[PDB]
Every structure is written in structure tokens, then in C-alpha cells.
Ligand binder design. Structure first.
Ligand SMILES: CCCCCCCCO[C@@H]1O[C@H](CO)[C@@H](O)[C@H](O)[C@H]1O
Ligand SMILES: CCCCCCCCO[C@@H]1O[C@H](CO)[C@@H](O)[C@H](O)[C@H]1O
Ligand SMILES: CCCCCCCCO[C@@H]1O[C@H](CO)[C@@H](O)[C@H](O)[C@H]1O
Ligand SMILES: CCCCCCCCO[C@@H]1O[C@H](CO)[C@@H](O)[C@H](O)[C@H]1O
Ligand SMILES: CCCCCCCCO[C@@H]1O[C@H](CO)[C@@H](O)[C@H](O)[C@H]1O
Ligand SMILES: CCCCCCCCO[C@@H]1O[C@H](CO)[C@@H](O)[C@H](O)[C@H]1O
Ligand SMILES: CCCCCCCCO[C@@H]1O[C@H](CO)[C@@H](O)[C@H](O)[C@H]1O
Ligand SMILES: CCCCCCCCO[C@@H]1O[C@H](CO)[C@@H](O)[C@H](O)[C@H]1O
Ligand SMILES: CCCCCCCCO[C@@H]1O[C@H](CO)[C@@H](O)[C@H](O)[C@H]1O
Ligand SMILES: CCCCCCCCO[C@@H]1O[C@H](CO)[C@@H](O)[C@H](O)[C@H]1O
Ligand SMILES: CCCCCCCCO[C@@H]1O[C@H](CO)[C@@H](O)[C@H](O)[C@H]1O
Ligand SMILES: CCCCCCCCO[C@@H]1O[C@H](CO)[C@@H](O)[C@H](O)[C@H]1O
Lengths: 307, 307, 307
């Protein structure tokens, strides 16, 4: 099938970045146009990819079945409800009714997905030590944080905290075994771009947290940022190894973390906490997503995007 | 010996459920009679099982020695001081002096037990990867949370927080390796009922926390509930696999988590946080413990309770 | 080379203990003289060891290269910037300018060190399961906590919280796999003194936390102390096994945890939280570091200190 499921990282990153710029509109009015443009592009890409995945389900179902039952590849399916919710979050600025439908569909969908598949892993004998990949964060962590912030947008703050807690504790519970595995077992080049997902947890976490707690930059938020930056520095040092075999579209795996660096930066700035660091983070993350967009346009022009 | 040590889960669940109903007496006065009945039954069962275990120690000591030195079976011994403290907590409503004696005996006992046995594991060569079982939560986590809430009942809030922290961090430190093990290694049917202990940590944690913090349903409490419900949903989906080889008395392993869902629900309700979810949780957990009681009466009638 | 890198634990422990006594000066004025004496001795030892390590770098570089590339021995190098910062913290009482230079040198140095080496481990194939040692806490955890408290001393509280969060989450993320490894694999006698580093995380954590949060002994601080004491009790029970093959200078590995027990005790006492426990902790930790000093003087007199 021409669209790899991981390509949903593209509308993910663009949508999350739209939301970051939305949050600067009262500081700088021109930010709203930037936000609206990113949000429209993200939503358009999302519509296309959803329609493609619907085609995959109807006409390439055995491919979906295999990816679903894989103890590694199943995780990327979580990008579908994650991006559904982020597009709902964008659309809320124009039509809260349609936004709320998408947010609930994505929330119910992700929770059903993890409840069916993530739990099934605990039966043993399918997941192996070599299945311990960064992509596991998507259904386990990122999906819950996205529900948390989306439900908060709709006014469901206490429900949002339930999802937030599920994501935060799931993160802390998985990461220890992931990092140990990475230390011992060299992740093969074909999977290395997924190291970008390692950037996500702390930044997604703090972004979701600030979405639910009325943007109060408190001790927890600062603690999360600190570990987030540690991981950034580690991944920056590792970047040449990450791309040993060349630049590829899989690098959009970094975009959840990058866009969430941008979003959380707007809240730190608004709160007058570490404004200088905030400006750095916001500019850095925009530049890197900008480079992702330029490499993507390049690939599309050369006919090297779709399978 | 006719009584398996794990049968202490029975008075555990009944006692904790008594405490949950106790907490509804000011909302609904009739809750006190329900609480008192459960508490008396729990205490009676506890007396019987303690006397049986005393008989085991005196006359079947090599069985106790073997269970103690086992890197898997040692954990169930922690049920003894846990239930001692919970019975003390019940009895506090009638006789705070006797209650305080039981609470200190259970606290000193559990701390000595873990200090002797849990630490010894760090010498290596005895505990194996296959020893990584949910039962490890009992001495490591549940016992500290029970001390925390019991000491808070007696007015020792800051000491309670020390025990609370020991339990909470011990939980977060063990669970990562447990879930990885479950993913890789299929837990054999003879141990699967112990999957019920996986329900316990977040719910016991929040119940203990709310016992020490004057029932303030805050961000931490909501975060814990969220992960607790995630685990519930996972265990509900796994339940047919859990009971693949049939229903058994080991299912009382679920009762710490179920009773703590009930207890924490009363505090969320009192705090006007997620009242609807609270009512669901309280009813659900009571119904499931009710089913445990019905299956137990059935087994006793058929002569299939004691070994 | 005559000085093992681990000997930097000596000025570490003495320096941290100086800081603990400094914090009692307003309660008991004579504490300042004790603090100043420990601080001068710590600083003198530090100067000597730094000059020795400079000699090692210039004239024994291949030894440094090998220790740096080792997935186990690299960690002890982090003691160098850690102690640089602690000596800066001492010197702040006399010369804030020189203190600030040392604190930034140690902060930049430790962050560069971990960014280069800790991240490199994630490439796989070098670190092995048997590399999972307590010493990993030094670059990963202790160095960040030391930056946190040192930057707070200089007035950089929000930056301090970033370092604090990096250390705290790094701790929680490593400890699960460490304790599992210790359970399964018996740590060989030649490394067992490093079990003392297991005492460090919770106590260093709470000490750093209280340094940044204006000494407010809150729920987090109490939670940390509780797990800290759990680990102390475990290590006390394990102590005969730790020293199975005899007392050795490696036991200074305990001093980060002991000195941080002392420091945090002063803050709990100041806050009127668990004063009795605080007095116990402060006396205990001073006595144990005192014994370390006596065994060290003994070794120096017998010519058994330097390699
Ligand atoms: C977007 C998510 C895609 C879902 C793919 C579902 C794969 C399910 O797959 C199948 O479901 C059947 C029952 O319905 C079983 O009988 C099949 O054996 C099982 O493979
Ligand atoms: C991502 C949006 C929602 C996910 C829908 C997934 C539905 C999966 O379908 C299910 O797969 C199971 C296996 O785990 C089968 O056993 C079930 O019979 C079937 O319900
Ligand atoms: C896994 C890492 C979890 C760390 C959680 C940090 C504990 C929250 O820290 C709390 O922040 C509050 C608001 O700023 C303060 O009022 C409290 O004093 C402080 O304890
Ligand atoms: C996420 C962070 C993005 C925020 C972008 C802020 C860029 C504004 O820049 C700031 O403008 C201020 C007045 O507006 C000046 O006082 C500051 O010195 C200047 O740094
Ligand atoms: C309720 C808990 C039951 C405790 C069982 C204790 C098992 C101890 O067992 C024994 O202790 C002796 C020392 O006293 C040793 O010499 C024995 O070799 C050791 O097996
Ligand atoms: C559960 C209530 C309290 C528990 C009491 C346990 C006492 C265990 O007994 C001990 O077992 C040790 C091994 O770890 C032996 O080495 C000791 O000599 C003995 O003190
Ligand atoms: C392992 C998961 C630990 C998460 C700890 C959550 C940090 C506590 O969260 C804190 O709650 C306080 C009371 O509601 C608020 O005042 C603070 O703003 C908030 O930071
Ligand atoms: C742990 C939760 C158990 C609490 C049980 C509450 C059942 C009461 O039910 C509630 O009664 C209220 C007045 O009392 C009505 O206003 C509410 O609509 C109704 O839901
Ligand atoms: C206090 C810390 C000591 C640092 C020791 C550094 C070890 C680096 O070592 C070397 O660096 C070179 C590049 O500079 C490489 O070419 C070498 O192959 C590599 O071994
Ligand atoms: C402890 C105080 C600061 C630490 C300085 C460490 C400098 C290490 O040096 C580096 O080692 C690398 C390998 O990881 C080499 O690849 C690099 O070329 C070199 O920069
Ligand atoms: C890994 C363990 C992390 C536990 C973090 C504890 C959460 C912080 O606990 C918070 O402390 C605050 C200050 O005392 C209180 O105001 C809040 O009510 C409480 O939730
Ligand atoms: C880290 C803890 C070190 C603090 C040492 C405190 C020793 C003082 O001791 C205390 O003195 C008080 C008046 O000063 C008396 O009221 C107390 O009863 C006594 O315990």
C-alpha cells in the first residue's frame, strides 16, 4: 500500500505546530495567520491520509491485519486517532461541534485500541526483547496525552487529568526498559529514525499538563522541561548515528517532540519563566519542522514519497 | 498445610471494603451498618487465619521456611501484617487502644519483613527472571501503603508520608520490569489469578494518599486514578485469558485493587470530583467482591476451600 | 596511576557534609566552625586530587581514554565536575566570584560529559547487561542534582529546577533496571562497595529539591525521605555482604547519600518536620562519615591509600 502508516506523523507535527502558534496570537497577532495556515495544511493532509487508510482497510485488509498483530508495527496505528484529535483541536477555532465529534472519536478510538492491543501483549510469547522500540510510546503515552489536552479544550479538565495520568505513568513505566534495551542492543538503521519519538514524552507531557492546568508553569512543568532538554541534547549528539544511512521521511518521528517543545515554550513565555530558553526552543523547533517540510517537498518532487 | 498463605487476600478485601463503606456514613447513614458487618466478618476470618498460620509455624515450620526463602512465594507472607493493620483500622471505631497495638505490630512486622527478605534479593543468584511476578507488590508496595494509611488514622501524618513515599516509589521502580516480563514471558495458568494484583498499585496508592492528605482530591489523586482505570480496562480485556483454566479462589488477588477503587471512589465523591465515575467505581467494585464472596461460599459448601 | 578516579568520593562526602553543617549555623552558631573546617579539608583534598588527575591526563592519557570508553568505569569521571561544584558551593561563603566560576565549570563540564558519553551508550553493543552498575547514577543523576542545587545557590532557581528534573526523572528511569539486575546477578565483591551509591538518589534528590524550593518541607520532600530510609534499611541489612571481602576505601561510595541525609535532616529540622528522625539521621550520617575518615587515616598511615 502506497502510504506507510507512519506518514501520519506528518499531519501530527503540522497540527501540533499550528496549536503552538495559536497560543501566541494574543502576544503577537500575526501568529494567528501562521497558525491558521499550518492548521489548514495539516487538516488537508490528514483528510487525504485518512481516505487512503480507509482504502487500505477496504482493499488491502490483510496488510492492516498484519500490522495490527505485529508487536512492533501495531503502534503506528495510534497515529490515526492522535491526529484525528489534533485536527479536532484545530477545527475548534472555527466549529466547536465538529471539533468535539472528532475529539471523542479519537479518544474512544485510542482507548479501545490500547485496551485491545497493548493489554494483549501481557499474554506473553509474541512481543520479544527486540520489540522494545520507541514506537511503543504512541499508543501507550502520546495517545493519552492527546486525549488529555483535547478533553481539556472541551472543558473536561478532570477527565483530562485521568488521561494525563494514564499517559504520564505509562511513560515512566516503559522508558526504563526502552533505554536499557537501546544501551544493550544496537537499533538497526531501518528503525533508527524512530529515535525521534524518544524526544516526545517529556515535551508532550508538559504541553498536555499546561493545557489542563490553565497554563500554570509550576514545579512539575519545570521538572518535565529539564528532562526534555536532557533528551534533546542526547538526541542531538546521536543525530549523525541516527542518519548514518541517510536522511529519510521517517525523521518526521521527531515532530511530536519538536511541536510540543514549541507549544510548551509559548506557555513558559506567557508565564515569564525562562523566556530566553523559550524563544530558543520555539525557534529551534520551528526551524527543524521547516527542514522536515523542505525535505518532504523535495521527495514529493522526485517521486520518492509514496510507496 | 490446609490454608494457603494467599488466602489472607480474603480478609484483606473484606476489611478494605469495610473501610470504604465506613467513609460513606456521613453521606448515607445506613452505610455504617454495612461497614460494621463487613468489618466483623473480615475480623473473624482474620482471627481464624492467624490462628491457622500460628499452627503452621508451630507444627509445619519447614513449610514456612520454604515459602519464606522462595524468591516468589515469600511475598504472600506480607498479607499477614497487611491484614493485621487493616483489622486494626476497623477496630479503631470501637477501641483505639487495641487498634493502635495491631497497627504498630503490622507496621514493625512488614518493615522488618521487607528489610530482611526484599533486600536479600539484591545479593543475586536466587531470584531469577521468571521470579518477576505481581506478588512482589505485596511486601514492596501494598505493605507500605497500608502502614501509611494506618499511621495516618492514628494521627501520625508525617510518618505516614514516609511510608507512602516508600510504597509509591517502590511501585514505580518495580512495575517497569514486571510489565516487560509479562510482555515477553507468558505467565503460566497456575499463577495467572495473581494478575489481579496488577490492579492494586494505583488504587491502593491513591487511597493511602487521600487518607494522609485529609481527603483532598488534587492533581496527584486524579493522575493516579487515571492510570488505575487504564490498568482496570487492560485487566478486564485480559480476564478471559486470566481464567482460561477456570475460576478459582486465587481471584481474591483482585480484592486489594477492587476495595481500594471503592475507598478512593468515596473520597472523589465527597470532593465532588468525577462523581459519576465514582458511583460506577464503587458499584462495580462492590459487585465484583460480592461475586468473590458467592464463589467462596460455593467452594466452602462443596468442600473445595481448604487444602 | 596512583589515584583511582573513585577517590573523588572523598572530597565529595566531606564537601557535602560541610554544606550540611553550614545549614545549622543559625540554630547553633558553633556549627559554622565545624562547617568551615570540613570545607577547608574538602577543598584541600580536592585541589590535590584535581592536580593529580591533571597529571594523569598529561602523562597517563591512555588510562584516561580507557576509563572514558568503558561502559562501566566512565561514570566515576563525573565525580570530577560534581566535586568542582561542591567546592564552589563551599567557597561561596568567602568569595562568590570564584564560587560562581567553579559552579559553571562543573555544570558545563557534567552536561557535556553526559551528552557525549551517556547518549553514546544508546548506540548499543558496548554496554552489556553486566554493565548495569550503581555507578551509572553519578553522571546520570548525582551530577544533575549537584548542578541544580549549585545554580540555586547562585540565584538561578528556574534553571536549577531544569537540572533537578533531569536528575529526578533520570533516576526513576534507571533504578528499575538496576534493582532487577542486582536481584538476578550477584554483584562481584570487587564492585560491592559501590552499593553505597544506591543510598544516594533519594537523599541527594531531596537535598537538591530543598535547596531550590526555599527549604519548604512539603509532600514531595517527605515522600523522598521515606524511600530514602527504605533504601538505608535495606543497605544496613546488606552491609555484612557488602563487606564480605573486607573494609575498603571504596566504602566512600556511601558518602554522597550519608552527607545528603545530613543536609536534608537540617532542613526537616528547620521546618519542624520529624525532628526526632532528623536528629537521628544527622548523628548517624556524621558518625558513619567519621568512621570513613578514621579508616582513611589508618590506610594512609599504613601506606595503603595510593595505588
Ligand atoms: C485501524 C485498525 C485496524 C484493525 C485490524 C483488525 C485486525 C483483526 O484481525 C482479526 O480479527 C478477527 C475477529 O474480528 C479474528 O478472527 C482474526 O483472526 C483476527 O486476525
Ligand atoms: C485505532 C482506532 C480503533 C482501533 C480498532 C481495533 C479493533 C480491533 O479488532 C479486534 O482485534 C482483536 C485483537 O486484539 C480481535 O480479537 C477482536 O475480535 C476485534 O474486536
Ligand atoms: C516523575 C517526576 C514527578 C515530579 C513531580 C513534582 C512534584 C510537584 O511539586 C510540587 O509543585 C507544586 C506546584 O508548583 C508546589 O506547590 C509543591 O510545593 C511541590 O511539591
Ligand atoms: C515561545 C516563545 C515565543 C515568544 C517570542 C517572543 C519574541 C519577542 O522578543 C522579545 O520582545 C519583548 C517585547 O515584546 C522584548 O522586551 C524582549 O527583549 C524580546 O526578547
Ligand atoms: C512469618 C514469617 C516466617 C519466618 C520463617 C523464617 C525462616 C528462617 O529460616 C532459617 O533461619 C535460621 C536462623 O534463624 C537459619 O539458620 C536457617 O538456615 C534459615 O533457614
Ligand atoms: C511478617 C512478619 C515478620 C517477619 C519475620 C521474619 C523473620 C525472619 O527471620 C530471619 O530470616 C533470615 C533470612 O532472611 C535469617 O537470616 C535470620 O537469622 C532470621 O532473623
Ligand atoms: C509518577 C507521577 C507523579 C505525578 C505527580 C503530580 C505532581 C503534583 O501536581 C501538583 O499538584 C498540586 C496540588 O493539586 C498543584 O498545586 C500543583 O500545581 C501541581 O504541580
Ligand atoms: C463512592 C460513591 C458512592 C456515592 C453514592 C451516591 C449515590 C447518590 O446518588 C445521587 O444522589 C444525589 C443526592 O444525594 C442526587 O443528587 C444525585 O443525582 C444522585 O446521582
Ligand atoms: C576527563 C575526561 C577525559 C576524556 C578522555 C577522552 C577520550 C577520547 O578518546 C579519543 O578521542 C579522539 C578524538 O578526540 C578519538 O579519535 C579517539 O579515537 C578517542 O579514543
Ligand atoms: C568531565 C568533564 C568534561 C568531559 C570532557 C569529555 C570530552 C570527550 O571528548 C570527546 O570524546 C568523544 C567520545 O564520546 C570523542 O568522540 C570526541 O571527539 C571528543 O570530543
Ligand atoms: C515519583 C514520586 C513523585 C511524587 C510527587 C508527589 C506529588 C506532590 O504532592 C503535592 O504536594 C504539594 C505540596 O506539598 C501539595 O500542595 C499537593 O496537594 C500535593 O499533590
Ligand atoms: C539535623 C538535625 C540537627 C539538629 C540538632 C538539634 C539538637 C537540639 O536538641 C533539641 O534542642 C531543643 C532546643 O534547642 C530542645 O527543645 C529539644 O528537646 C532537643 O531535642
Amino acid at each position: 500500500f502506497p502510504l506507510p502508516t507512519g506518514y501520519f506523523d506528518i499531519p501530527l507535527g503540522l497540527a501540533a505546530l499550528s496549536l503552538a502558534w495559536f497560543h501566541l496570537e494574543n502576544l503577537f497577532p500575526a501568529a494567528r495567520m501562521v497558525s491558521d495556515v499550518l492548521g489548514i495544511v495539516a487538516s488537508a493532509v490528514w483528510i487525504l491520509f485518512i481516505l487512503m487508510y480507509a482504502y487500505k482497510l477496504r482493499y488491502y485488509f490483510e496488510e492492516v491485519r498484519a500490522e495490527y498483530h505485529s508487536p512492533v508495527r501495531f503502534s503506528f496505528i495510534a497515529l490515526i486517532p492522535i491526529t484525528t484529535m489534533l485536527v479536532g483541536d484545530i477545527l475548534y477555532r472555527w466549529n466547536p461541534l465538529i471539533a468535539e465529534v472528532l475529539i471523542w472519536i479519537g479518544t474512544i478510538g485510542q482507548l479501545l485500541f490500547s485496551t485491545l492491543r497493548v493489554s494483549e501483549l501481557w499474554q506473553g510469547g509474541v512481543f520479544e526483547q527486540k520489540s522494545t522500540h520507541p514506537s511503543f510510546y504512541l499508543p501507550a503515552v502520546a495517545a493519552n496525552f492527546t486525549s488529555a489536552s483535547s478533553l481539556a479544550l472541551l472543558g473536561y479538565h478532570d477527565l483530562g487529568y485521568l488521561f494525563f495520568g494514564a499517559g504520564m505513568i505509562a511513560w515512566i513505566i516503559f522508558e526504563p526498559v526502552l533505554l536499557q534495551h537501546l544501551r544493550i542492543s544496537s537499533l538497526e538503521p531501518q528503525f533508527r529514525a524512530t529515535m525521534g519519538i524518544v524526544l516526545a514524552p517529556a515535551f508532550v507531557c508538559v504541553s498536555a499538563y499546561l493545557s489542563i492546568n490553565h497554563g500554570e508553569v509550576d514545579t512539575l512543568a519545570k521538572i518535565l522541561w529539564g528532562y526534555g532538554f536532557l533528551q534533546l541534547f542526547f538526541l542531538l549528539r546521536l543525530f549523525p548515528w541516527i542518519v548514518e544511512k541517510g536522511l529519510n521521511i521517517g525523521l518526521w518521528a521527531f515532530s511530536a517532540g519538536l511541536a510540543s517543545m514549541a507549544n510548551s515554550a509559548t506557555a513558559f513565555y506567557h508565564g515569564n519563566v525562562l523566556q530566553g530558553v523559550s524563544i530558543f526552543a520555539f525557534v529551534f523547533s520551528n526551524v527543524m519542522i521547516g527542514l522536515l517540510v523542505l525535505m518532504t517537498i523535495y521527495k514529493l518532487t522526485k517521486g520518492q514519497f509514496f510507496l
